[PDB]
Amino acid sequence: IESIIKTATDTVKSEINAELGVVPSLNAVETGATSNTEPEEAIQTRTVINQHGVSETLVENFLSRAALVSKRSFEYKDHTSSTARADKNFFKWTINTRSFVQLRRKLELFTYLRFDAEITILTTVAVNGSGNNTYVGLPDLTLQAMFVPTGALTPEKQDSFHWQSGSNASVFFKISDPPARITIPFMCINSAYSVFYDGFAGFEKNGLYGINPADTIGNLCVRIVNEHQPVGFTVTVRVYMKPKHIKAWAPRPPRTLPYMSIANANYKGKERAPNALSAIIGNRDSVKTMPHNIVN
Amino acid sequence: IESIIKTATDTVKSEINAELGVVPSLNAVETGATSNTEPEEAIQTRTVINQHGVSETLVENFLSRAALVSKRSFEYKDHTSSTARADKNFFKWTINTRSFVQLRRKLELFTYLRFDAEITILTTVAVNGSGNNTYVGLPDLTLQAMFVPTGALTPEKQDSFHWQSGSNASVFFKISDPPARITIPFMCINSAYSVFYDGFAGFEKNGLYGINPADTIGNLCVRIVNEHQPVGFTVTVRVYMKPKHIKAWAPRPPRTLPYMSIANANYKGKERAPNALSAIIGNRDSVKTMPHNIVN
Amino acid sequence: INFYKDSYAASASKQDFSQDPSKFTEPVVEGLKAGAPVL
Amino acid sequence: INFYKDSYAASASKQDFSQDPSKFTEPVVEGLKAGAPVL
Amino acid sequence: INFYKDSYAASASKQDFSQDPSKFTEPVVEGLKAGAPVL
Amino acid sequence: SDRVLQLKLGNSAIVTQEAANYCCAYGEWPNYLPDHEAVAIDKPTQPETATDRFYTLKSVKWETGSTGWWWKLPDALNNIGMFGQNVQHHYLYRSGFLIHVQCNATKFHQGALLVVAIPEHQRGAHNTNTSPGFDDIMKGEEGGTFNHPYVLDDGTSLACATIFPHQWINLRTNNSATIVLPWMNAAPMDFPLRHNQWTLAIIPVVPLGTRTTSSMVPITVSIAPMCCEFNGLRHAIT
Amino acid sequence: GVPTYLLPGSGQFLTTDDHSSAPALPCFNPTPEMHIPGQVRNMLEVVQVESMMEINNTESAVGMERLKVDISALTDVDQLLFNIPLDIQLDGPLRNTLVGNISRYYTHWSGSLEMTFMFCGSFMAAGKLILCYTPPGGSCPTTRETAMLGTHIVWDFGLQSSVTLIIPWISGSHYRMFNNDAKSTNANVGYVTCFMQTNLIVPSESSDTCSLIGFIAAKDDFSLRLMRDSPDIGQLDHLHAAEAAYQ
Amino acid sequence: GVPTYLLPGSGQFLTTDDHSSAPALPCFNPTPEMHIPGQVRNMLEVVQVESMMEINNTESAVGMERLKVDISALTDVDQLLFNIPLDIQLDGPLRNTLVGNISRYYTHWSGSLEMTFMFCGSFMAAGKLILCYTPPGGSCPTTRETAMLGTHIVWDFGLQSSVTLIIPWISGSHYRMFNNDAKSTNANVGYVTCFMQTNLIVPSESSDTCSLIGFIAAKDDFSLRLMRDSPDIGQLDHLHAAEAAYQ
Amino acid sequence: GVPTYLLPGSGQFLTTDDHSSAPALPCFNPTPEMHIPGQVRNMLEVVQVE
Amino acid sequence: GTHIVWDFGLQSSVTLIIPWISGSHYRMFNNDAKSTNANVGYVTCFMQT
């Protein structure tokens, strides 16, 4: 039944029981219900007034933490002789929560999630080695982070006119300023994000499995506004996400085997236990062997 | 008896006393009580209205001061050819209050303590000598301080994935910003920290004596977020602790002999007085010798 | 402190202390009484 | 000034002026009256 | 604006407009009337 | 009035005709653990008179060069009678104590013993960085002796030991000391085999002296647990 | 204007901070809420659901075989069948459970647990077992006459196929800690043991070896503190296709 | 927004500052409070407990022998036995006391003190002493007829084994200072002296030398100001195993 | 939080400014006031003495 | 067992009470000293200091 729970439940003292027809310790697992055997019915207890709070396990508290979701390093320099695949003073990132495993596993503890997302961008800069074998100092550069909806037109170069950002939300920030922060609303076309999706997002048979683009927040396009300096630098941008105003539905078995890809739940497991395909828990000598037995 | 004391007690005027059976100046130390002889009963006094405040000796005021608890210097550079024991752009510190003696002695004036801990982190940087015999300037670096519970997984390298900090509290701060500050709650599994512990924290006989890990706040893992510069620097991080919301129980004899270790109360004493094992107070010629006698 | 015009900009909401574990622990049409045999 | 949601984040509390020195100075079951011999 | 807990931390107090020059100008036991000879 | 005292607990009784009041540590009295402070949920056993009674330890001899003696609680009582059996069969223990220290001599003798109950007397070693071992600390009924009573074997001062609950046995004045100790711990209950809440220390601040014919002058300790309760019944481990 | 001064900690980015921040999409209207079954508002709801213990965590036990314990008919009385360590911080039979997995995101834990055993033999199979919880302090009991001195329940096989042993919260401190020192006085919970009370007796037509399945859950007196990164997941490199998100 | 401007002192870290700061662990529930005996809320409670003076702070007095003063039978009248300097800032008999140790964490002090002497001779020992407090200004008295002119108490040995000499607060200023100039007019308290009033008289069977133990405490008119680092502790290097905390 | 912006003159040290500032010694109790003869509260009192 | 610690002093006499601790309502004055219906137990005196 629904009730407001702020502290752990109290224990009431209990006496001897010798009653026919009453077996609180016996249960029927086959029904799918969890055993209702209380400590008062299993042993003789005292009275305990429990003042232990339960607020730290609140779903909001459990998930509302800034977790690293993106890390991208790129060279800030003249990119005339750079390869096509290189990030020429700017990068684009399709936003996802599946690249860093701690937050991914925490989110995947649930089937459905609804939250707004606080986004924090932290920038660091270093002077390139083997480009100029000397140090002069770190410039205070200005960066532009533009939100572009998934599939929409992204900038093709650092000085592209697409950065004019007529309607796209853009944030300009300096390396010397505190990390930039913006709140993105819950943007799913459905009432909740689908953490897991058992289907195909296309009307033909060649669409991606387990991927619902309605659950992709969008694209983040980050550029250095400053034109290049005579010497080269390496700029690393870290994007952190913190869910807030969270609602969660249908908890799931936690991930055990290591993640393989950000696109699927494919599994291989470790070579040996723990967290191997044939053995999740580490082995002991026998079911009669106590691993950390106290011996005096 | 319990009473609210804000100022020192007043003195009342007194007259001559020649009463049989009344000896206020005589006491019995053997009972363990402190003498109750008032100045009014020992001499003839005047009336004095005492307005002297007592607030500066309040336990809260006595202990709620930012005291240095940790100081760690490490090189910020390319650590490819560095030794294993060296701090390669990051360090880990098991939090304790026993390394710097002023705060340690103040805390050890009590048997039990309960407080939240304000933590302030101050960073300084210098250009390495004998590495590059020149000065170019001081970079404005970003540092990450991650709280890791005692015994839990700590990062093994500067760019380790463990720094992603899915659930661990992490603070990012710049050298140019004011010193970072966070409040850690009273985290002991008991109702109070045990400043002294007369026991062993293990169920076998080889556990550490006098160490209760329930009284260890945790581990602080500090890294430079920036990748290394072409030249080397020396970065010094100082951690200061200030107890607050303090409750104190069972005051103790103050430490006299110099501390030897942060792990025990082992003592050796100075070679000679003062604060020597066989003589705490410095010597005088005789019990009839006045050390600083006024002679005119 | 929220001076923004959009409600989703607000800080987190850690006040929802309502629980219903029985939707996971006892999802049976016929409730099970303590002491009485389940079957 | 405390805009944080956790009470332990607050500044120090230097208002507790209550004292009871007798728990250290006179921890005897039978109180000692002034002037009267202790024994 | 004073959010500090110690009163001596407050800004200056330039409101004390009370004066008594006679403690320096006329410190005589017998006051001197205008016009009347002093001696 | 304040010189004679009878202490009666369980089937045991002690009389003294030369007491000097008696001390209640920090003005408190022992009591059972109340429900609003309880942690362990199993019903505790409260043996009452079977365990809350005076146990007398082996007497020690006051000598001219004696440095002092100490006993640790509950360790000293952990193998004595029904208290010892309950301790050995239960994971958790809780109680206070009533300590009575006895030492008599003639009116021609002089001497002064500080009888102090030290909470959490974490001992230190002398002239080494190695922490004291298990055998150095856990002495049982026999107890131990002070290596350097001047610094209480912990780098502190004997002169300031009076901050702790204490009495004095001054031979010209009294022949016994009595201290009542409540439960003193950060936790409501504790494992009795690994932690010692209290340490009784008897230190001869003024050495024993006389010019009559010498006689053995022993010091005897009687400790009565109070409001004993135990939790976590299982097989005996000792 | 307003005279101000910046405190220590100004400009810092604390991951656990709680502040309002600028809305990037003004006047955005989120999709209307729809009722969805199985909402969870406190993780303590999850830990109360019993999940299967991996008691048979031994070599030669592969996959699903690790989740059941085989019992056969014995020709000696009062024999030990198995034991379960009770540390929900180290690797062991309790780790890969709902309570274990959720609790390992935290450092401190308190409250009672419940272990439910379902007998999965034939209808004709009969037997009595004894399940004992031993509070810590000594070695794990290896004989029935020692284990029966602690908390225990005698289980008689019958129409009710499942029994529950309650591991009550018996601790000196308000909380225990999920520290790596398994033998610490603030960590060790004690042991669980299972002994033959009479025997497993089956007819010739039934299988002579019968399996038990063990589940564990937390009661509603259970609570957790001091959240921490779970040791149960980690990465040493970027996942596959993670780079493609930048292309 | 709000127009503001930063004051001098913005961004500084003052160790004695008092501000709220960000909670690193949101929604953490601290362990419930438990009543613990011997709570202390003001350090002035500690200084009121008498602790032993080290009057016998001389060479050849080793350890515990420094905490007692020996008195023997004399064959000349009105003889001096010992004196006590009264500076609780410099090294001396009062330094390693509860009042001395706590006060040395401060710079200013005020209020009356009490010195309690316990005679620890045999029951048969008899004697009368005189304890004198001399307010400052001149040399420490060396004869009884000079010391008796100041504050004093005549102590008769008997069933009550202890006497108290009150050192009342006699000072030109509201406070005295714990400065290193022992002869300053704002520091010097005066002297304490002990003289034979009649003699120590014992029978042949009793010990001919009897010890006194001196204690000192502060009364409840005592107060301290201007907290400072205690000179009684210091380090020139890192303590042992301090480095291991970083490994 | 509160949106703000720094005015011209922010961070400057003006010798004639009048602001509160951090107390270096918390809970310090100053010596009680004593009546002292010849208090002066306005320098115009001094200039009136010939 | 049951005991009293006796301190010599102005009160020159101490009393040890041997309380009636018996399984049966009465004991018997029979010649079998070791019978369960006869034996009362023992009294001992030890040096305390």
Side-chain angles (χ1 to χ4, degrees), chain A residues 45-115:
Chain A
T45 59
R46 71 164 295 150
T47 300
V48 173
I49 309 301
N50 200 317
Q51 320 192 263
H52 293 170
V54 303
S55 59
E56 224 186 324
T57 51
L58 290 170
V59 160
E60 184 88 352
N61 184 71
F62 187 72
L63 290 176
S64 208
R65 291 161 128 61
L68 177 66
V69 295
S70 162
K71 180 170 132 56
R72 194 57 167 188
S73 309
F74 59 102
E75 295 173 89
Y76 166 52
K77 67 174 208 252
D78 191 309
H79 284 276
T80 36
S81 321
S82 275
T83 58
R85 223 97 273 181
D87 311 300
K88 303 169 166 83
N89 297 325
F90 87 100
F91 70 93
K92 172 240 86 168
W93 176 59
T94 307
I95 297 157
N96 68 81
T97 52
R98 278 128 36 215
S99 306
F100 293 86
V101 296
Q102 286 287 332
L103 176 63
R104 180 186 176 161
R105 180 183 200 255
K106 291 226 309 211
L107 295 179
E108 289 190 350
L109 295 175
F110 307 94
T111 306
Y112 294 117
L113 289 173
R114 183 195 175 105
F115 55 86

Side-chain angles (χ1 to χ4, degrees), chain F residues 30-52:
Chain F
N31 60 105
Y32 288 116
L33 177 60
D35 302 326
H36 64 86
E37 293 182 340
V39 161
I41 66 166
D42 56 318
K43 179 180 203 269
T45 180
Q46 293 180 1
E48 295 183 282
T49 54
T51 57
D52 305 335

Side-chain angles (χ1 to χ4, degrees), chain B residues 151-186:
Chain B
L153 280 202
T154 64
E156 82 285 343
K157 64 189 169 152
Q158 176 193 23
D159 56 356
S160 146
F161 275 96
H162 277 124
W163 296 105
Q164 78 183 268
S165 205
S167 292
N168 292 341
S170 262
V171 62
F172 298 86
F173 51 101
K174 277 188 275 273
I175 298 176
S176 74
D177 281 287
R181 180 172 279 175
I182 57 147
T183 288
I184 288 187
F186 170 71

